[PDB]
């Protein structure tokens, strides 16, 4: 015969090897595949769809959890004040656990890329006003005034013309580097006779085409 020699690592069962095995039924011919629509080749195709952020996650909304998806704008709020504030970390707790991006980051360890947050006004057609969607890079502090938040990166969103605005967070990373997003009343909430005085905004979030993650892990 041919002279062979056994190396160390013989008769071990490493649970993460990709080797061929003995077929239990060699004569069996399984059912050939057909065309089924919606085949997923990569998990990043599921991360790039816009799912609903849960920004209104107060303690007093746990018994009626349908109110957690929408947060209100009203008519008795003065101009130049803060409406909402949340960090830009998908892997941590808080608002990002409701998204499909924040649930597929629990299955991994490191991720890096850009997100996009989408807002949507769900008020009456006759109502008008302005909001300020300010973004703070990691390292800087959350603004205390509307005027100091304007000097950074911000988007003036009037819902008298556009009922939905988008906002791109440029880069996040994980190996606190958080990308705090704040909503400011630019103007008040103008409303005519007959239209309701309070309205609600929903917030959606998804990843972009340069979002990757690695080092698979089990939650």
């Amino acid at each position: 015969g041919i002279p062979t020699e056994l190396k160390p690592g013989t008769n071990q069962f490493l649970t993460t090897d990709d080797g061929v095995s003995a077929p239990i039924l060699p004569g069996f011919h399984p059912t050939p595949p057909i065309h089924i629509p919606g085949e997923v080749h990569n998990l990043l195709e599921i991360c790039r769809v816009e799912t609903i952020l849960e920004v209104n996650n107060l303690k007093t909304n746990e018994t009626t959890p349908m109110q957690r998806l929408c947060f209100p704008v009203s008519v008795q709020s003065k101009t130049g004040e803060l409406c909402a504030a949340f960090r830009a970390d998908p892997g941590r707790d808080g608002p990002w656990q409701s998204t499909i991006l924040g649930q597929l980051c629990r299955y991994y360890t490191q991720w890096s890329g850009s997100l996009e947050v989408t807002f949507m006004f769900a008020g009456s057609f006759m109502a008008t006003g302005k909001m300020l969607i300010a973004y703070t890079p990691p390292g800087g502090n959350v603004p205390a005034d509307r005027i100091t938040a304007m000097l950074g990166t911000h988007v003036i969103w009037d819902f008298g013309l556009q009922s939905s605005v988008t906002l791109v967070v440029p880069w996040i990373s994980n190996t606190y580097t958080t990308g705090i997003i704040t909503i400011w009343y630019q103007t008040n909430y103008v409303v005519p006779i007959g239209a309701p005085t309070t309205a609600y905004i929903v917030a959606l979030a998804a990843a972009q085409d340069n979002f990757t993650m690695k080092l698979c892990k089990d939650t």
Binding site: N11, Q12, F13, T15, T16, D18, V20, S21, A22, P23, I24, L25, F28, P30, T31, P32, P33, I34, I36, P37, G38, E39, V40, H41, N42, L43, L44, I46, E54, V55, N56, N57, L58, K59, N61, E62, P65, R68, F71, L82, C83, A84, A85, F86, R87, D93, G94, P95, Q97, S98, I100, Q103, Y107, Y108, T212, M213, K214, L215, C216, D218
Partner: protein, 208 residues
Amino acid sequence: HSTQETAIGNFFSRAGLVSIITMPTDGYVNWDIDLMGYAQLRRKCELFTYMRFDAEFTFVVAKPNGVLVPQLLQYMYVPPGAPKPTSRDSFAWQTATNPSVFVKMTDPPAQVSVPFMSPASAYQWFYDGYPTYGQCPNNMMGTFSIRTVGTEKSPHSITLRVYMRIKHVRAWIPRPLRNQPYLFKTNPNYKGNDIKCTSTSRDKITTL
């Protein structure tokens, strides 16, 4: 940089434990192949609707405390539709159509690859209608029957653990991941008296 670790093969690799079988001093066991027994690999498989793959089992067998004895074992695979063994000395143990492996305890563990065993074109974890009584499909991968060979009783307690890899994975039609706790192993019956919120609460909407 690279998007190769989120692929559908790398998501379902890395063979994990599916069952631990104790056979202390009947004389045999039947473990039918099901994957919705643990919390993981059920919540990971219910992300999709249709999956098509072929398994690969490994039988790590020992005594209740580590040790190995020179004992001969038989692991018989009953295909879907074939009748299972009833007793230790049944007729089904000598049937030529049920493939068996014969391995000692003092060997490397036995590996067996089982193909795609469904009459349809993909396994489905969610079946809306009725098969005929309950709303359940008929995937039915098979059954593993395990015994020690010989006609009198072996004086050795046998505990084996079954590991399983998932090869050639194809998945269709993604679905929301379950956030509610599991109650049973056939239906998506949740506890409707208390509903866990998806997120964790905070004090106010501005307290970041």
